[PDB]
Amino acid sequence: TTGRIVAVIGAVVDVQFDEGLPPILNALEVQGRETRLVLEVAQHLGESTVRTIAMDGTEGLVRGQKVLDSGAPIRIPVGPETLGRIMNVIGEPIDERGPIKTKQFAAIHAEAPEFVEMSVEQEILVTGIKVVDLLAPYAKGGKIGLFGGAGVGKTVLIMELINNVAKAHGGYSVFAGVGERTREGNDLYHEMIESGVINLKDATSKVALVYGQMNEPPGARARVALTGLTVAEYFRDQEGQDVLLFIDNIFRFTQAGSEVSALLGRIPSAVGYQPTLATDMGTMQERITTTKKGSITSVQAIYVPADDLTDPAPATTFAHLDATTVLSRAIAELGIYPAVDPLDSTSRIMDPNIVGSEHYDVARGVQKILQDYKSLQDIIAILGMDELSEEDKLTVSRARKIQRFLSQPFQVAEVFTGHLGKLVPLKETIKGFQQILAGEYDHLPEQAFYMVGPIEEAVAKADKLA
Amino acid sequence: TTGRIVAVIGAVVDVQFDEGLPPILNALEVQGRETRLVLEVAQHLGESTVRTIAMDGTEGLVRGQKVLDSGAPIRIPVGPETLGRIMNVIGEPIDERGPIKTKQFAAIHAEAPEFVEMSVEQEILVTGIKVVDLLAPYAKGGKIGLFGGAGVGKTVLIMELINNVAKAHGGYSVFAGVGERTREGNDLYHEMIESGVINLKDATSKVALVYGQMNEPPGARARVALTGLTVAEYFRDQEGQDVLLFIDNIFRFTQAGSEVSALLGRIPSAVGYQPTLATDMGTMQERITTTKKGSITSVQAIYVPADDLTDPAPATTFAHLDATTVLSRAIAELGIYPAVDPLDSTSRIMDPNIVGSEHYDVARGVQKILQDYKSLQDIIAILGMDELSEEDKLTVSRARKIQRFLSQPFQVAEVFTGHLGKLVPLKETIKGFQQILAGEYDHLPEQAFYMVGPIEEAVAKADKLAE
Amino acid sequence: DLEETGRVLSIGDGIARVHGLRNVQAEEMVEFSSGLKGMSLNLEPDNVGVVVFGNDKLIKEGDIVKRTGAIVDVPVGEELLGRVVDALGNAIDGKGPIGSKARRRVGLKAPGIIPRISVREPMQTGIKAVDSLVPIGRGQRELIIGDRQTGKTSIAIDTIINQKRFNDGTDEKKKLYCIYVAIGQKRSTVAQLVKRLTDADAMKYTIVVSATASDAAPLQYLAPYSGCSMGEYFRDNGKHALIIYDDLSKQAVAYRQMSLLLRRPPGREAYPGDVFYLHSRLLERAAKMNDAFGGGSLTALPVIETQAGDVSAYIPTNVISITDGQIFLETELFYKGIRPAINVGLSVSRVGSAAQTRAMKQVAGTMKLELAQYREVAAFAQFGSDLDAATQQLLSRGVRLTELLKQGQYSPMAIEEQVAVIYAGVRGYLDKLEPSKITKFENAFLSHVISQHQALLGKIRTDGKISEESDAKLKEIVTNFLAGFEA
Amino acid sequence: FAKLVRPPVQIYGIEGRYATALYSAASKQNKLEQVEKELLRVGQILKEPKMAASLLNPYVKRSVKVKSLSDMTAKEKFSPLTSNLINLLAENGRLTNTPAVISAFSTMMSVHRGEVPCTVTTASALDETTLTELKTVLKSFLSKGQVLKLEVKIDPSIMGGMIVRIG
Amino acid sequence: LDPVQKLFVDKIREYRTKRQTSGGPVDAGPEYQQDLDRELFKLKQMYGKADMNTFPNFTFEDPKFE
Amino acid sequence: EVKNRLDYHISVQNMMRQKEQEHMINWVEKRVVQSISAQQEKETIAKCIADLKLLSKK
Incomplete structure (x- = not known):
């Protein structure tokens, strides 16, 4: 069937097909269009008109122009x-x-x-x-x-x-x-x-x-x-x-x-x-x-x-x-x-079942501490870059490590990283934090965690500094 | 006069009353109403159609349905x-x-x-x-x-x-x-x-x-x-x-x-x-x-x-x-x-006029006092005591009594509370607090006032709490 | 004569402006040329704005719409308990021919003043924090509110799991027929869930009415009402049914959309007005009925999963005016690992206690308070800053109770377990413990009483209540056991 | 006002707003059909390019057009109301609407008096009967052809789906 | 009605015509097999490729002590 | 471990009946249908019942 452009208001081509209006979503091809100017039937608007949408752009279109329905979507x-x-x-x-x-x-x-x-x-x-x-x-x-x-x-x-x-x-x-x-x-x-x-x-x-x-x-x-x-x-x-x-x-x-x-x-x-x-x-x-x-x-x-x-x-x-x-x-x-x-x-x-609790728990602990750390930011605002209440300081510092420990190079992005990607196979991760949680680096530098792969390399990285 | 449901779009029942249109605010009776469905005329929409709001049924409604105007609100x-x-x-x-x-x-x-x-x-x-x-x-x-x-x-x-x-x-x-x-x-x-x-x-x-x-x-x-x-x-x-x-x-x-x-x-x-x-x-x-x-x-x-x-x-x-x-x-x-x-x-x-100054002022004294007591509350609260001078304490206390006098035993929830809802004629009230304020009662406890209506019932309880 | 035939004047957008059918009863189901169903929503002067159930593209202009001539009804029944159906009661489960003996009109009103009765009959969820701090009964309306996976789903689950024993209990005041209207929950989600209920086989006393995410809007929209009809069915069959309407949020959107699409206004905050009415009536159709209705109940735990504590949020504000309290769930606790989530003050049972076990009330009364005072200081100088000793304790206590107020993932309780542990804390027995070990206590303690003092637990269930003896039995058990638990 | 003669067919608004004017007008004096037919006649006195060419064309921009088609064409014997209601529609542009107004009318003595059953089996031949289920079998002597246009195909449809419908 | 149940008939006579033809990719064309092989392989996935056609044997086992 | 072996065979026979159903169905429904209207008088038996609906629906 053919429809006639009755109104073109941008890529919504309201087409009057009087010749039978195909089911909605039926893809129409506009005739006179050498372009694959697909119109998708959008409404059987009533009155032989369907609202269609051209996907595409409606330049050069005479009114009445004939559109021939592809009869299907x-x-x-x-x-x-x-x-x-x-x-x-x-x-x-x-x-x-x-x-x-x-x-x-x-x-x-x-x-x-x-x-x-x-x-x-x-x-x-x-x-x-x-x-x-x-x-x-x-x-x-x-x-x-x-x-x-x-x-x-x-x-x-x-x-x-x-x-x-x-x-x-x-x-x-x-x-x-x-x-x-x-x-x-x-x-x-x-x-x-x-x-x-x-x-x-x-x-x-x-x-x-x-x-x-x-x-x-x-x-x-x-x-x-x-x-x-x-x-x-x-x-x-x-x-x-x-x-x-x-x-x-x-x-x-x-x-x-x-x-x-x-x-x-x-x-x-x-x-x-x-x-x-x-x-x-x-x-x-x-x-x-x-x-x-x-x-x-x-x-x-x-x-x-x-x-x-x-x-x-x-x-x-x-x-x-x-x-x-x-x-x-x-x-x-x-x-x-x-x-x-x-x-x-x-x-x-996530679950201590599904992901195993080692995973889960490490995460919940992590999630916990960090949110708490946010609470602590509030403190810090009073108390300063190296002055607080000390356990809490430890955890803060750890949070600072943790942060860094997530930071991970990119192979692609020499442009963002410079670095090259370092992939962490999963256990090494869970452990990675679990260990940090274990505070085994509680004497290791803090940003000796930044843009790493697995945790060892972070330890390694500390050395590389001094 | 009858109208017909011409349109029901929700409980705005669009009625064309096919016959005469009564007031706006008119209650119309939809006929066919198992529970009287008053439509309240909201607008005389024109074309003998009124806008109504259905107040009962909003479903099952057959279009065209006959409404016979109740002819008044x-x-x-x-x-x-x-x-x-x-x-x-x-x-x-x-x-x-x-x-x-x-x-x-x-x-x-x-x-x-x-x-x-x-x-x-x-x-x-x-x-x-x-x-x-x-x-x-x-x-x-x-x-x-x-x-x-x-x-x-x-x-x-x-x-x-x-x-x-x-x-x-x-x-x-x-x-x-x-x-x-x-x-x-x-x-x-x-x-x-x-x-x-x-x-x-x-x-x-x-x-x-x-x-x-x-x-x-x-x-x-x-x-x-x-x-x-x-x-x-x-x-x-x-x-x-x-x-x-x-x-x-x-x-x-x-x-x-x-x-x-x-x-x-x-x-x-x-x-x-x-x-x-x-x-x-x-x-x-x-x-x-x-x-x-x-x-x-x-x-x-x-x-x-x-x-x-x-x-x-x-x-x-x-x-x-x-x-x-x-x-x-x-x-x-x-x-x-x-x-x-x-x-x-x-x-x-509240006025020194209408409710008179006795009320007003006493109240003003009180309201103030309550606040004052409140003010002191702030201090003391944090600083333990003889953080005040005891005139402040006295007022604090007076206020407490006054406070308590607002408590009134309860009748309705006597079932819970025990006692009864007591009623306080205004003068006893004005007088009442004024007296407490005046410290005229201050040499007595405060729970006295607690659960009392009348200033007497407070006084009586005051005595009673002084055993 | 002639049959009521009619035509789709125009169609697009699931909005069929419809010729004829003047006879149209409001919210009459029509039947389409596309074999589809619709609802005659807008009875327009000369046409019918018809909501298309499901999709439209099947349809096209001028197509015949024949009246079905019926205002909709839904199957109701209790075979359904042990059925996941869509709202129309169709075997989306794939179980097939659902036992669905009744069908019942969806539009059956909320009971009268006199038909109803106040709640005072218990209910519970197995969630200590919940049952304790919001003490529960039947026939209710309570907003469950919290975010994605503010155990969100979990919440429903443990509550349901808890009813198992109750369903293994024989009452209606036990066997709570659970109705889960799953709104906008993609099938995968549902599937996932469904699987859970089965596993918990709480599903046996449970209908799951499911209008997933994909769904056409009216379908989703309708689903609660559907749910509503079905639960009123139980209610009138005595039965105290539990509907979880999950979520009206999803509905609202759809519905709002529906109005708009119907061109019809939405309303305030850009969303419909009488969607409140929608719900108001919906939820009024939940009630705690008098005795005439077999004590009739539908306890409704409606759910809204919040975006950004938007309670201010139109429907929430609305809803806020409606429920019998709302259950505020708090994430922080979740991330903290703390499950429950809750912000309690925000959580409310307006009702409070009347449906509460005296057992609990007796130990819990004390707890609420212990937390209350605790809470102000829960807020105070939280950091490594001293307090006065009183308060150092309250804080300790509070903290303990917090742990206690945790409840494991997929680990429902029973009132005695709860009371037990509450008793434990109230009577201070585990302030002693530094907090981590509480959880260990509780379990151990539980498995212990589970061994012996089912004597007691059973008893407590029996008396519903603690006697001075039971207390005394507790007292030793815990103290010593506790002593054993520790050392 | 003047209570209105709303005998349906009509269309209720939609030049039922018009129609009903004449469902009270034609109706009084019972020039119902008299006029019903005036219109029919008229229609095609229109439908030649009186119709396109100025009739529904204003390019003059209707302003003089409506003040010349009030009198050059509305100039007729069709006029007890007929041209006058034209002369009403005109300014009021409802000239472009007219088929439908007429339609609305004509469905009146011609088809008010119609027929309509339409099940899935029917799709009435709408013949003009005030009573039902009678003619409705005479139809079976009518019955002798179609693709089952007036009354239906009950083949692909009824039945054809059914096997599907079971599975 | 047996123009109706002629068609219940009419398909059921091809209940017998096809069923006593054969049925499968038969009365019906290749199509069925071309899926069938894959779909029954999915069943092999639905059980894993643990042979659903060999009688299984069973574990003889020990947990740890001192 | 036994059940899996058995259930596979069950599952196949079910799936094969459904596929045979679709394919059986597609051939059956595509084959037979014609005599309802090749006998135009089996649309007269529709017209007959429809005249017995005509009269005898009311």
Whole structure:
């Protein structure tokens, strides 16, 4: 069927198809558009008109212009032939490696599994990151959401994770750059090439990239999310894959949704949002999971505006999180890299059972002392850089070590670190702190803990000074 | 005349009355109403359509359904016949002890008394509770606001007030439990029954209970206010009384209105309030007064919105508040019974004039004194003693006695306390504290005053504590 | 004649402006061309704004909407106890054909003044701190408030686990039929949970009404009301049922959204007004009923998981005016490892004691106080600064009690265990211990009485109360045992 | 005011606001149909490019247009109210609305008097009957064709899903 | 009704037609096997690759003392 | 350890019946359907009951 542009108000193309209006989400192709100017049916508005959204941009469009419905939602290439390929939203090689050779195609609304398919409980996944494993012990297949503001090398971290993991990964991975800086993706790309993780003799790279950058009109960006999901579901169920799913950022999707909300005529929401936010999310978050048909381990970047999280979006997000990684800009500011918010990088999951108490307890002790240490800051404000109540001083000092002990080099970031990454295998971590807790370095220097790998090397490092 | 449901969008039942449109404020009867569904006309919307608010059913409603206009606003049972009856908003037995024994009906929109009908001077009401009268002297017909502790027995006190006043005057009471928990009203009910403020033997107890709980449409609760007023107008005018009107809480009232504001598409206000917040309050407050028949002395239990008053309404409320009650949970906690915030048991209406200087001054001395004692408390507290000179101690002590004299043994909760609610004629009061203050009694202990009404009962106990 | 047929005038957004069906009863279930269900929310002059249950894209303009002609009802029953269903009572569990013999209209009102009765019949949670400091009964409404994993989930769990024995107890005033409305809880979460209940097999006396995160909004929205109907069913079947409405927060959002989407106003703080009414009535439908209703109860522990102590928060403010108290949970303690979490002052049982065991009341009365005074000094010069001795103790005491006020992860209690340990602290027996060892005491002590003084525990359960003897039995047991525990 | 003759069909607002004017107007004097038909006639006296070309076109910007279509075209025998109500709609732009107003009307003596059952089995042929379940079988002698447009296909639908519905 | 239960029939006659054809990737095409192999392998995952078709044997064991 | 071996075989036979169900179903439903309307008079038996709804729904 064909529709006529009856109104173009930006990338919301209100199309009157009188010829039969296809079900919602049906992807439309605008005729006269040599561009793959996909309109997604949004409303059967009434009166032969559908509200559609172009994903894309509406320049050069005469009114009445004819739009021919693709009769279905977005059908896109899906399956193993995608890795190392950068597609945008429309399954569109922006790999520039041309065709994506997934014969297997998809309508891109892929949905939430059923209760019975729920792999009801999961596994602590280890990352070799002290902080992570310790504090927000990762889940295989979980949705972990990295609250974090921009520019801190969230992306670096994520990347870092990719490095440590996606390299040594059995599964495959999907990278959904949702509203990512094209440039940063460019670079990012170039690293991957470099790294050979994007090994170009492999469209079976460990990661398939879907990039749906900021520059795209929102609809596209919003939808890049579904798209990427649809692919990943292929791998998950079909290719079995333990997917690592990088989303950067869902925030931009949601935001994209919110942007349109008005313009969908709809009310947006409080905090500007899109009223449907929760389902939007819900359906999505629930869209992904660990079935007994693989796992999509979801590394979800969540930009958190003003790191304000009551900021409804993050406020919601948490429900869908399994491990919440709240990266602390303060901590970043404290120079720490990992710059994390430790107490808010959490997993509700952690247990003296699950993670074993050694882990658990060490953490609870740690969590405890540090929060108490905050209480102590208040004291210090009176009492000064080397003057307090002394046990308390010890613990303070220890906190000062501890802080540093989390600090960990980056191989990538010669630019942030200079250093080169030092990975800590987990036990060495638990122990690392457990030991510190044991105060075995209660005579060792304090920042002889900063930007290390495992704890020994920190001891070693003290020597290197003097 | 009939109307048809044309639209129901929530309990705003959009009615086209297909036939004649009656007042605004008109109660319409939806026909098909198993429980009488009064729609209260809110707007004559135009096109023979009125905006109404449904106050019963809000479901199952068949569009087009026939409404036959009740041709006037709501009529509710009135006369004495309301007394000792738990009426709901419709003014109907939620006593569930059979019907109300009414004969009189009333529109719950009665209109605010004329300028001439005001007893232009409202003249101090005395409650027979020292703490109250002295520090917050009431004005007859007055609107008193109650900030105060949960479960303390606000109500206990209130019951006692009812006892003291509504009993020891011709005053009856109307209680409008607005937006209240049905549960507490139940507990209270049995309690009231129990207390004898409600008497299941005084069919006309000194209380008519009116409930307009949360689980209703707002309007109903909102209007429960009007209702309550309406009853009290009966007791005031008709029964010539000082009606005690418990409105609990205005906060819930205002809020109830406001809930509708939105839906009504009304622009509410800053802080979200209904625009009509003022009028809502105002007319209503204006409808309360001292007529020259009686008084509807309005004692308004006040949940404090946002625990500030800056929240416009209470500030406004203040315009209508002239005796203010802040209850001190703490003092109560000192085992003091009654045990208000004394310095915030206040009244704009304390005067060396109206309540006379005897009162005023003595009080001023006291209030001050209490504070002074308070001042010294601060010192001593931290510094142990003879951190004072014992005139300060004396005053401290006097204050303590005075303090204690505000404690009064209790009748309603005599079941708990033992003793009885004692009542303090004003002069004994003024005199009373003055004497203590004068140290004329200071050579006696302080628990003397503890649990006493009359200054004599304090004196007597003083003697008694001096064995 | 003709059947009531009608058309979807327009559809998008789950909002079907709907032709015809004039006959429409309010909140009538309609049946769609898409086989879907809807609710006729807005009865508009000439159309029906219809909330689409689930998704819309199946639908399109002009599609026929046939009345179902019914205002909704939900299955009710107790087979359900031992069922995870969605709100409509459908086997999301995958158990299939649910025993769901009744169905019952969801819109069945909250009982009268006279039908009700005040609470004074106990209830408990196995959480000492809770039962002690908020003493509990049946028929209630209490806000459980706290953040993600302010044992958040845990909270419900231990309470439920505790009821097991009670459910192994035979009363209705024991066997508490637990109803968990899981709102916005993604299936994985639920699954995770569900698994727990089963394990605790508390699930047997438990319905889990589940509208996960994904869900269409009305579904989630509805779920509590659903839950409500079902519990009123128990209530009227005597039964004292426990509903945990988990969370109205989630509902609120959805619902708010619903209004807005319906174009309909939300209200104050940008969110609906009579969502209060929603709840007000919802929660009023929970009550402690008189005897006529078989003592009828639904004890409602509604839940809100807070963002940033936003209590100020519209619904919370609202709710604050509604419950029978609120349970404030405090994270700090959690990070501290302290579980319970609670800020107590913030926690309230307006009700307090009337549903409380005298046993506890008797030892606890004293504890509340010991903490109370303690608390001011709990605040005072907390650091390494002296105090006067009195207070050095109170602090010690307080601190001890704090440990005592911890309660393990997935480690419910029983009143005697609690009273026991409370007794222990009250009677000062473990101030003696420096704090770390309390936990060790308690367990050891417990396993000890568990060996012997079930004599006592059983007894205490029996008397419900401590006699001077029981006290005396305690007294030695603890002192000596304590002595043994230590040395 | 003047109590109003609201005999449905009509549409209730939506040039039911108009229609109902004539559900009281036409109605009184019972030029109901007389006029019902005036309109029908009129319609197409419109529907040639009187209709596009100036009729629903203002490019003159209706201001003179409405003061010349009040008289160059509203100039007719169709006028007891017919042109006058036109001359009302005109300024009031409801000229662009007219099919529907007429519709609304015409569904009156023509179809007020209609028929409607529509189950999933039906999808009425709407024939004009004041009574029911009679004609409703004459339909079976009517019955001789369609893709089951008026009355339904009960095949893919009823039944076809059912196997699915069990599983 | 047996145009209804003709269709209960009509599918049930292909209860028998297919069931007494065979059924599987049969009356039905290859499709079933192409999943089947993988789905039954998932069952092998659902138990682990501990052979669900070999009788197991059992531990003979000692904890520590002095 | 015994149960796992057994339950696997159970689980397979269930899963194989469901797959045979889908595939059986897809072929059955796609095969048979036609005679309801190839006999137009098996839509007359719909019209017959529908005339017995016509009259005899009321």
